[PDB]
Subunit: 270 residues, 2 copies
């Protein structure tokens, strides 16, 4: 599509936590022993309870939102407040949500997506990999490029505006989303402060990779993603500088390998 | 100075919250009705109770850290874990802390600074404006430029490495610190996940303002910070484009004003 106002938003579990204010919901949640379903980790066996009762829980959460309104969740509150601030009309909006492949997050995500659609706002939910260690953190970043950042690219190529809602989600993820999102051409970043109940447009300077580094990185790609130290020397690529910035890693002992996430980043410019 | 490993870190109040585990601290804080001192808002009259008892509370908190270790606060836990990961030695480190000009935050900041110093790590604490509304948000950003980002510029000009600790602090501020910090030449951004007790280096690509925007912004600046529509046209500046990205604002009958924070940003690229 073209000419749309696209909002990109991570999915947290404030909806799950907030819903416990409703006695009906709480009762059912207690019957299932899911009192802290908003905090369940990816490997908690109680995720399977959510999964086995997904349809029932979804419909129940939809009832909760319908009655509660935007304050039902941090996603909804920040989204609707920002539509009003920037004067985005329902018929113009596309809400792009992403959650981890975990039952509790996926439930929040499907409910939020389905409610937006009920309200006349086009919405899509994508699923990304769980980050649970330093090693799989970078695998998660790679997946965010594939599932989210590259979609931002495509939205911009199709002549849409893109607004990043930084309100929900874990800090390190929102920092990445803001950074890579801006490099991919996102227009503005925004954040709703609950403290003073107001939406702020965060400074959104249009940015790009420094030209010298982009040049060096492209040489790396063009030549091969893993390069001997000599080959890299012939190309004028300052490997030790790139290593210090954690863009490449020594693979003993001739070789330097461009990190997977940096390859994805290059995709923005190729 | 030169050749140091400089860590830039915002100051939160996890220290205050964690210290309630110390019976001596907890009973004294209860005496002052400060059980919620970690969440005290900027305009709470009780901030003055912290101020009036600042030196006493500072020593009590120092005793707590001395006994508790790095887990006393998110700052200390993330800093010390990262020194170990990156192999930074105490003699090489400079910890640049910044807190708001509020009693509770400044208390946490001075205690953390003083503790680091006791352990042989050079440290400095600077104070920034409180953000409490959308209007004063941008005044806060401007102050972060003057107090923090411009110091990163100077650390880099004096041949030091700069590492941004994104662990503590409110999300929006950490996002700004990361962006402007990288633009100013910071080397790496890092974050300790408490959940799995490990420090990750966040992706830290070397970045700059897009060239055509930087050109437009510089043309704007050298001509004047508030420009008529007519003059902006003659300079070839697409003011509506800049307005849409919230870099300039329409003022008066026919003028466009470069936002204060954008003027500070340009300071990175001009002298
Ligand atoms: Mg407002
Ligand atoms: Mg590790």
């Amino acid at each position: 599509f073209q000419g749309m106002e696209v909002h990109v938003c991570s999915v947290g579990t404030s909806l799950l936590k907030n819903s416990l204010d409703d006695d009906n919901v709480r009762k059912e949640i207690e019957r299932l022993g899911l009192k802290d379903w908003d905090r369940l980790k990816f490997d908690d066996d109680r995720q399977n309870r959510i999964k086995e009762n997904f349809d029932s829980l979804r419909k129940m959460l939809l009832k909760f939102i319908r009655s509660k309104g935007r304050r039902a969740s941090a996603e909804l509150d920040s989204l609707f407040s920002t539509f009003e601030k920037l004067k985005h009309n329902k018929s113009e909006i596309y809400v792009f949500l992403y959650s981890t492949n975990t039952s509790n997050s996926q439930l929040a995500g499907e409910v939020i997506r389905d409610y937006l659609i009920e309200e006349g706002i086009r919405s899509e939910l994508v699923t990304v990999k769980t980050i649970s260690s330093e090693e799989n953190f970078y695998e998660g970043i790679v997946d965010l490029f594939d599932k989210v950042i590259y979609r931002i690219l495509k939205f911009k190529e199709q002549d849409n505006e893109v607004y990043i809602n930084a309100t929900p989600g874990l800090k390190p993820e929102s920092i990445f989303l803001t950074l890579a999102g801006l490099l991919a051409g996102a227009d503005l970043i925004y954040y709703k402060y609950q403290e003073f109940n107001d939406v702020v447009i965060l400074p959104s300077p249009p940015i790009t990779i420094r030209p010298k580094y982009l040049d060096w990185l492209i040489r790396f790609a063009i030549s091969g993603y893993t390069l001997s130290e000599k080959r890299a020397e012939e190309l004028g690529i300052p490997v030790r500088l790139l290593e210090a910035k954690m863009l490449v890693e020594r693979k003993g002992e001739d070789a330097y390998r461009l990190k997977d996430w940096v390859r994805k980043l290059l995709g923005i410019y190729l």
